[PDB]
Design a protein around this ligand. Structure first.
Ligand SMILES: [Mg+2]
Ligand SMILES: [Zn+2]
Lengths: 689, 56, 83, 226, 577, 27, 237
């Protein structure tokens, strides 16, 4: 989706604030060519478009679209790429049309669009051209979203935008229910091993596959193993087949990322509950079950990279070595012969990565410390102890070691003698507060990781996975999760429809040959032509039970459940079932920041905040207005003075905290006096009285 | 905005402040005359009863 | 009247305490200067004695002098003037 | 009236790993809380055996591959998480597993030291080719419940040590249901049946009566102790 | 409080304390020992945190109460737990927002936290005097289920005497708890007990006692359900009974009265008990969503067909050229709006009341019935991104399943809908900011200005066919005011004198007088030089009593007006108007 | 459906699709 | 196993029969293992006596009228309900309260037979206006728990004896809540809060030991399969 992407702004294009809110909206010419759904939620609406499925580029530089052409009520297969300009003159028919076996219409009266785009209803005489399909207004990532036609387009914009931010897991079970896109998606993605030549398998490995082509020659295929992303995710690849298989050109041999069995997978199938419970689902709060963390089913992979070099200075050169200034040896016994640490060390924050040391120069010391150095009998050296250490809240093993040097023929920019890189990976458990969502735009964070026993559970006693709250339903208009709840439990359950004498009217048309299901099934519904509502109620009417004769889920799709806390059954049947969920990338180490005392700017005395900095917390304006609204002015005098800009106070209040003495009075903000000097620079007798 | 002409005329006027406004007192960073800033409230003598001081 | 037992910071209730000061502000500065006298007092208690006195009410085992000054106020043991 | 008798128990065996347990008579509405009590116990409070950590000669860390095998290490970790074993004594003894040649790594191919047994010998682990060699040692420890991974650096173990989360759990699924007479002359009594399936480590009598002994241990201060 | 971040924050303080008992030699063993995170820091940490306030912020800053104080204690993990009632003041949702951290060090500011900035005592609106930590959606459905009244319940008060007694009588409430916990007595049934600890309303203990209906130890019969019983068990002892179904407005009146006549500390206690019980029954209320729960409007089709013959006749008359474009356009607007109104009325008329779907808005929790009409029923008319309505119209529902085309039209009002949001919340602080600017010298200066001028109030105009009808807009107009003029009657006597706070009993008294005009002191007549006087201004919304001297009211007025300007929708009636 | 190593997945397509999806990288 | 801690018990003394209990420490998650358990336990595991059936002379057909007194019939019913009596005999024992003339009848005004006792004899029951001679039949038997009112085995053939509910439990209200304090040193262990409401008959501490003792006596059924089983150990006192 970074590709196929339509952008408005840029060089040779408009200015962002200087373009009005009229180019942003859609026009009826946008139909069939650019999906109106996929756009970022922030200040880019109308600026970033998304290219649809069946579009194609004009050699002149425009969008061309195929359409089926009908002559005299006979629809041909004559595929004609068309532009919107000639489309204005012409007659575009309807996708879901009562078409009878030739291209012939049952009805004579058909909905149609004019060149204005107004929806008119016409007799079946003028129609030259017909739609090829449904989903023509739909982009690619839009097309993986089932039951779109039953929920809000705004929520569709939300969760549609959310699915690009999914993370890979380590298991990759296929989703229980999808559409005809996911198998069709990854085969053009090119992260998955596609069979180039139709041959037979000769011999595989864990890391390579040596194939046997039918005509003579062979070929090996090195799969990539644990490659680092641009964001630090896992790009491991893995074989799925055996060593002697007659394969065909185009087939899947091995998959890499989130895909499985030829199709994408953003998570797992889980058992869902729809009750509100003890405020732990309070306004989109989400809870979990204990089994998943212990069965590790949501485990993530994160690779973080560090890099530093050895350079030259005016005095001399930087040094990478095992020789350190004054330091412990416990912090050295995991390092190699020549500085850097060895393979497979587990670090904590503050540990030393690369031994880096530079010369000082020739300075003087205090006589008191020079005395102590005579007392402890150790002059150190004329160098500086400035080595590479790990940033904070970080752990994990180091896998790869990459290292360059100027004297060793390595091309690298000037002033530099030597380079090194570090790759640090880490298994991370799922914990509280992380960003979880379902496909229908519903989302939220993890409040409480429960034990396994305080949990809703069946008459057969099977514990539930998550519980969702009621009130996300009405006002956000997102009942498609309920739809796939019923259909999902139909899939886990399985059926065999007992119409041995006569098919019911819900199932009288849809396909044939479908009226059974072996459970743990593999099903799909397309975008606009999937199931219908009485059919959904119809599949619930067959209820192939787990072990014994047991209708746990009634004809209204609810179950009777027990208290997992005190024990008694609940006095109402509860909507429950299965839902396919997913996990995103906003972990708690990412957005955490904290600081008592650190680095500051050189221009101002303000704290500086970046990646390797602790971060600083930007305090605004209306905040100060509300501080005035309390009138807690001593707080304000604390904030803007001893915490912001006055250097000479910071040592005083910090040292007072050290001794536990009184809080000193906040002195004059010296940053204020800087303005006065600027006024005195410009012919101003300014004065205080 | 247009701060130059806003300053240079008052410099002819040689006008001053009264420190009465409070947003200005944020700019100078001194205590504002609002909330905890009134002199009758920030100038409290604090001393015990002598009877409690007889307890010692 | 009879309400409940309070917990920690909400102990004591401010409802009796707002009776003692006409405003909230002089209550704040009142406890503030008192607590300044106490944090004077312990770093005065360490070395040689001065005319600084206190505390009037017994503390807990480990208690900060802010709440100690609050309980001095709720005990109703001293007075003040305005400015 | 104070109807005066004492309820009893008996067993109806369903399979080797699954069976029935009936308890009657009862106080009215009572058996719900006892049922959640014993269920809530058996989901948590049974000791067992679990392998803790391993070491393979061919690796230094986790995320590499052995030449000759088909599978990466972490998939094997997830496989051996699904094993079952039972300890006799209480100390961290070691194990071994070595194999050469093409084939499938079965759980029954492993050499046990004296005192432990494994209840699923044909469970798949991995596969190899002509070119591959198998080497793995296994450290099994005794305990209860869930434990997360311990730190190697805090511990005194070697470089090849691989800490993995261990779960001590014999049980798979616990459920129950009641039969309430409540006859309409107020001599009311109920009926409880219990069904627990373990994962073929111990009998339901073992976790059942042992957890009951833990309960009787648990309410000692609930007695006339105070 | 997340504890790694907490220990990361409180470093110099714990570095002071850990050396004081002899765990360390110096600062260097202290700081290094912190960087090792040795396990000896933790029991120190509970000592150094307790009795120290903290501050928290969520961007953007709309009004004053978006930063409030607490006393923290430790929480396992890297997530910030939070009491739910401050989400109203924060405008917060559990989606993945951020919140900020602030911390004073000077004990003066710590007292500023523990007295003014503490969330314990900022309960009401500074703009209206209604509360903000007044409970909401799930507590609403909890109390609403727990206090609704259902006839025909099991074991309900029978009486059919002649063969057996009345059989609805129970001695103690805990008796009814016990029999309720057996399956015979049902929870939501009308029963009769006698209450020995709680207070009956005015009419009952009036005729029982007259002098004092004190209720520690004397009983009185009643007839309610058990849910309202344990409801009023959570109420304070001095307060009488209620016996109504609980609405958000009703509980707003409850918190209103208890906020008036009582000290502040009891309130939060009662509220925390209310969220406890409200969650307890909010669980067992059993509110689900199924596909079968959304019912089908049965004869909606013939209404659609009726207006299809109407619109077919109209558009035929446009096709002939009997009328022009805009006239048939507006004709379709009005006719299809009438179709929308009929399907709305038949839609609400069809449903039973025990649908959990309607029960939300029956409690008035969130949304309205129009959202149900979009859910089940019909959507109707979609605007242009230009702004004009589109004449198609939209006929189906989400539950009925859409076609391509109606959804494709709904794109316009959707996306042009979400375009306006950042425009609103962006442009509001501009005007709001200038309101902060011009008002920044508006403070309380002294106690009393003592002019005699004053404004007059409308005060529930006559309508002499009923001779008294009440002003709806008393509430922003008459309360928190001070009399500069004496209230005079039909010739009589001065019933209310100069200088009272003008609450509800003044409305009762002057309403008993039946007068409509009282000159009342306001801020527009204040003759002070700079600032205004407390008598000129009156009762602040904060305490519910007379404002103090150290206040600058213009800021609170600025946040009050500029704050809810986001929620303005739709000659101009809009916000830039 | 025109995919060699495809697993079976049952659909609710009432219509057919005469033209297949083009290649996505062809843009 | 061994729990590597030891939980403790302590009572807190409020007013007379308003005892209050806390237990620390417990590992997760064991407050809920015994909260509702001890609730139903002290609810319905202890025998007791209560009013079984009553008959008053002259209240034969008109179900709500007693002449000569202020009180109606149903008031006498509920007032006799809250009357503590303790006994030992496995039988519906008959009692008689009778009084002529005006007067204010109290709980001590009835003659008790052997085996029964009155634990609040100074309780009010009834007021007699003028010259209304009273005679009330009373039946009390033993039993456990709470019962609904039994329809007597006459089905219309009864002389006018009135059976009602019998509250054999001497307890009055059980409530509780949990907390999980000391989350780091104890590594997220727990905190128990108990509150019991009790009649004046005995101390709730006495009922505590007996009922929980019967709970221990009840799981001895679970104990008598494997003596050599593996339970988790607390330890000595
Ligand atoms: Mg949010
Ligand atoms: Zn004035």
């Amino acid at each position: 989706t970074h590709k196929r992407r339509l952008s408005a702004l840029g060089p040779g294009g408009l200015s962002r604030e200087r373009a009005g809110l009229e180019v942003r909206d859609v026009h009826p010419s946008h139909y069939g060519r650019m999906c109106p759904i996929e756009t970022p939620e922030g200040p880019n609406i109308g600026l970033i478009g998304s290219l649809s499925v069946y579009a194609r580029v004009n050699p002149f530089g425009f969008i061309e679209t195929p359409y089926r052409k009908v002559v005299d009520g006979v629809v041909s297969d004559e595929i004609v790429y068309l532009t919107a300009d000639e489309e204005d003159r012409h007659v575009v028919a309807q996708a879901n049309s009562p078409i009878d076996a030739d291209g012939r219409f049952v009805e004579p009266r058909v909905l149609v669009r004019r060149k204005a785009g107004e929806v008119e209803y016409v007799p079946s005489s003028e129609v030259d051209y017909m739609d090829v399909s449904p989903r023509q207004m739909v982009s690619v990532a839009t097309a993986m979203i089932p039951f779109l036609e039953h929920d809000d387009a705004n929520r569709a914009l939300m969760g549609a935008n959310m699915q690009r931010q999914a993370v890979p897991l380590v298991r990759s079970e296929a989703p229980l229910v999808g559409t005809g896109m996911e198998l069709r998606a990854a085969i053009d993605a090119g992260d998955v091993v596609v069979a180039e030549e139709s041959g037979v398998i000769e011999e595989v490995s864990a890391d390579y596959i040596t194939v046997m082509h039918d005509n003579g020659t062979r070929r090996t295929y090195r799969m990539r193993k644990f490659a680092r992303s641009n964001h630090g995710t896992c790009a491991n690849q893995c074989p799925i087949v055996d060593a002697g298989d007659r394969v065909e050109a185009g087939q899947v041999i091995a998959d890499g990322p989130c895909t499985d069995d030829g199709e994408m997978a953003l998570g797992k199938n889980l058992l869902v509950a729809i009750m509100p419970w003890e405020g732990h689902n309070y306004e989109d709060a989400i809870i979990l079950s204990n089994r998943l963390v212990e069965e590790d089913v949501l485990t993530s992979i994160h690779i973080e990279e560090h890099e530093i070099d050895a350079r030259d200075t005016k005095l001399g050169a930087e040094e990478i070595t095992r020789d350190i200034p004054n330091i412990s040896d416990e912090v050295l016994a995991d390092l190699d012969e020549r500085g850097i640490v060895r393979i497979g060390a587990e670090v904590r924050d503050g540990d030393i990565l690369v031994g880096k040391v530079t010369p000082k120069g020739e300075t003087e010391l205090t006589p008191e410390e020079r005395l102590l150095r005579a007392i402890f009998g150790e002059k150190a050296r004329e160098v500086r102890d400035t080595s590479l250490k790990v940033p904070h809240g970080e752990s994990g093993k180091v896998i790869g070691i990459r290292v360059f040097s100027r004297e060793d023929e390595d091309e690298l920019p000037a002033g530099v003698n030597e380079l090194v890189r570090v790759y640090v990976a880490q298994k991370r458990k799922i914990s509280d507060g992380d960003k979880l969502a379902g496909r229908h735009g519903n989302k939220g964070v993890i409040g409480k990781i429960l034990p396994v026993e305080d949990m809703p559970f069946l008459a057969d006693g099977t514990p539930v996975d998550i519980i969702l709250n009621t009130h996300g339903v009405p006002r956000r208009m997102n009942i498609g999760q309920i739809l796939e709840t019923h259909l999902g439990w139909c899939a886990h359950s399985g059926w065999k429809v007992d119409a041995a004498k006569g098919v019911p009217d819900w199932a009288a048309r849809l396909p044939d040959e479908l009226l059974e299901a072996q459970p743990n099934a593999i099903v799909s519904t397309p975008v606009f032509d999937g199931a219908q509502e009485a059919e959904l109620q119809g599949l619930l009417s067959c209820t192939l039970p787990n072990r014994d004769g047991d209708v746990l889920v009634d004809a209204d799709g609810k179950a009777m459940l027990f208290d997992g806390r005190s024990g008694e059954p609940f006095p109402y049947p509860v909507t429950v079932g299965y839902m396919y969920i997913m996990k995103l990338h906003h972990l708690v180490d990412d957005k955490i920041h904290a600081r008592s005392t650190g680095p500051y700017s050189m221009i101002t005395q303000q704290p500086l905040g970046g990646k390797a900095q602790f971060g600083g917390q930007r305090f605004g304006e209306m905040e100060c207005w509300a501080m005035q609204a309390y009138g807690a002015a001593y707080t304000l005098q604390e904030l803007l003075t001893i915490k912001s800009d006055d250097t000479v106070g910071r040592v005083k209040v910090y040292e007072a905290i050290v001794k536990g003495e009184n809080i000193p009075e906040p002195g004059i903000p010296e940053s204020f006096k800087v303005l006065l000097k600027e006024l005195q620079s410009l012919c101003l007798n300014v004065e205080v009285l | 905005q247009e701060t130059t002409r806003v300053l240079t005329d008052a410099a002819i006027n040689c006008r001053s402040d009264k420190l009465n406004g409070l947003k200005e007192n944020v700019i100078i960073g001194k205590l504002i005359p609002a909330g905890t800033g009134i002199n009758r409230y920030r100038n409290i003598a604090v001393q015990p009863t002598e009877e409690a001081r007889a307890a010692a | 009247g009879g309400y409940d037992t309070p917990l920690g910071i909400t102990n004591p209730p401010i409802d009796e305490l707002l009776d003692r000061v006409s405003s909230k502000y002089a209550l704040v500065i009142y406890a503030a200067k008192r607590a300044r006298q106490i944090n004077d007092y312990y770093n005065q208690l360490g070395e040689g004695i001065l005319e600084y006195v206190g505390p009037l009410v017994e503390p807990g085992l480990q208690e900060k002098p802010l709440s100690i000054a609050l309980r001095e106020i709720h005990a109703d043991l001293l007075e003040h003037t305005e400015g | 009236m104070l109807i005066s008798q004492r309820p009893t128990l008996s067993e109806d065996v369903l399979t080797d790993n699954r069976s029935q347990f009936v308890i009657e008579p009862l106080e009215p509405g009572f058996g719900y809380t006892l049922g959640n009590s014993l269920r809530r116990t058996l989901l948590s409070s049974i000791p067992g055996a679990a392998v803790t950590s391993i070491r393979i000669d061919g690796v230094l860390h986790e995320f590499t591959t052995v030449p000759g095998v088909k599978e990466d290490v972490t998939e094997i970790i997830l496989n051996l998480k699904s094993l079952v074993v039972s300890s006799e004594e209480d100390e961290p003894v070691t194990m071994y597993l070595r194999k050469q040649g093409p084939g499938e790594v079965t759980a029954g191919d492993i050499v046990p030291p004296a005192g432990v047994t494994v209840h699923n010998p044909g469970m798949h682990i991995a596969t190899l080719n002509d070119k591959g060699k198998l080497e793995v040692e296994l450290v099994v420890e005794r305990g209860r419940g869930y434990v997360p991974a311990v730190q190697n650096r805090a511990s005194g173990a070697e470089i090849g040590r691989i800490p993995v989360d261990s779960i001590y759990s014999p049980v798979l699924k616990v459920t129950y249901k009641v039969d309430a007479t409540r006859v309409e002359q107020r001599t009311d009594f109920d009926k409880l049946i219990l069904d627990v399936e373990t994962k073929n480590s111990i009998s339901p009598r073992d976790a059942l009566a042992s957890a009951g002994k833990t309960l009787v241990e648990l309410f000692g201060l609930a007695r006339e102790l105070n | 409080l997340p504890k790694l971040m907490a220990l990361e924050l409180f470093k110099p303080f714990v570095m002071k304390r850990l050396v004081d008992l002899n765990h360390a030699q110096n600062i260097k063993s202290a700081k290094r020992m912190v960087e090792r995170q040795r396990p000896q820091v933790w029991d120190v940490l509970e000592e150094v945190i307790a009795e120290h306030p903290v501050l928290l912020n969520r961007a953007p800053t709309l009004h004053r109460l978006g930063i409030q104080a607490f006393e923290p204690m430790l929480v396992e993990g890297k997530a910030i737990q939070l009491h739910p009632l401050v989400c109203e003041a924060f405008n917060a949702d559990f989606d993945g927002d951020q919140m900020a951290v602030h911390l004073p060090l000077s004990a003066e500011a710590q007292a500023e936290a523990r007295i003014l900035m503490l969330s314990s005592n900022n309960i009401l609106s500074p703009a209206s005097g209604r509360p903000l930590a007044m409970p909401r959606l799930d507590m609403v459905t909890g109390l609403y289920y727990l206090t609704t009244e259902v006839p025909g319940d099991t074991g309900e008060y029978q009486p059919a005497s002649g063969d057996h007694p009345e059989t609805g009588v129970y001695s103690s409430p805990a008796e009814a708890i016990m029999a309720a916990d057996r399956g015979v007595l049902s929870v939501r049934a009308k029963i009769k007990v006698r209450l020995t600890q709680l207070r009956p309303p005015v009419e009952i203990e009036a005729e029982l006692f007259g002098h004092s209906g004190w209720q520690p130890g004397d009983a009185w019969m009643a007839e309610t359900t058990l849910g309202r019983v344990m409801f009023n068990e959570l109420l304070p002892l001095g307060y009488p009974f209620v016996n109504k179904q609980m609405h958000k407005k009703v509980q707003a009146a409850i918190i209103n009265d208890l906020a008036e006549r009582y000290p502040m500390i009891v309130v939060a206690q009662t509220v925390d008990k209310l969220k406890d019980a409200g969650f307890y029954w909010a669980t067992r209320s059993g509110v689900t969503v199924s596909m079968a729960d959304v019912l089908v409007p049965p004869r909606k089709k013939e209404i659609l067909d009726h207006y299809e013959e109407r619109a077919d006749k109209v558009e035929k008359q446009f096709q002939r050229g009997a009328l022009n474009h805009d006239e048939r356009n507006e004709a379709l607007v009005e006719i299809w709006k009438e179709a929308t109104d009929e399907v709305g009325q038949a839609l609400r008329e069809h449903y039973p009341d025990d649908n959990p779907i309607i029960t939300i808005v029956d409690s008035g929790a969130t949304g309205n019935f129009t959202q149900t009409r979009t859910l089940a029923g019909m959507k109707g008319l979609v605007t242009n991104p230009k702004g004009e309505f589109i004449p198609r119209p939209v006929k189906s529902s989400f539950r009925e399943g859409l076609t391509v085309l109606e959804y494709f039209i709904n794109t316009h009002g959707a996306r042009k809908g979400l375009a306006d949001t950042a425009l609103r919340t962006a442009d509001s602080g501009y005007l709001t900011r200038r309101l902060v600017d011009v008002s920044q010298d508006v403070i309380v200066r002294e106690h009393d200005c003592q002019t005699e001028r004053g404004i007059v109030v409308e005060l529930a105009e006559r309508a002499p066919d009923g001779t008294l009808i009440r002003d709806p807009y008393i509430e922003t107009s008459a309360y928190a005011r001070t009399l500069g003029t004496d209230a005079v009657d039909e010739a009589g006597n001065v019933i209310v004198e100069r200088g009272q706070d003008l609450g509800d009993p003044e409305i009762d008294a002057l309403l008993a007088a039946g007068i409509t005009q009282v000159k009342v002191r306001s801020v527009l007549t204040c003759a002070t030089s700079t600032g205004v006087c407390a008598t000129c201004y009156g009762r602040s919304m904060a305490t519910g009593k007379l404002v103090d001297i150290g206040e600058a009211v213009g800021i609170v007025a600025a946040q009050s007006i500029g704050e809810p300007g986001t929620q303005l929708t739709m000659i101009t009636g809009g916000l830039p108007r | 459906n025109s995919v060699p190593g495809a697993p079976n997945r049952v659909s609710f397509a009432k219509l057919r699709e005469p033209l297949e999806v083009p290649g996505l990288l062809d843009v």
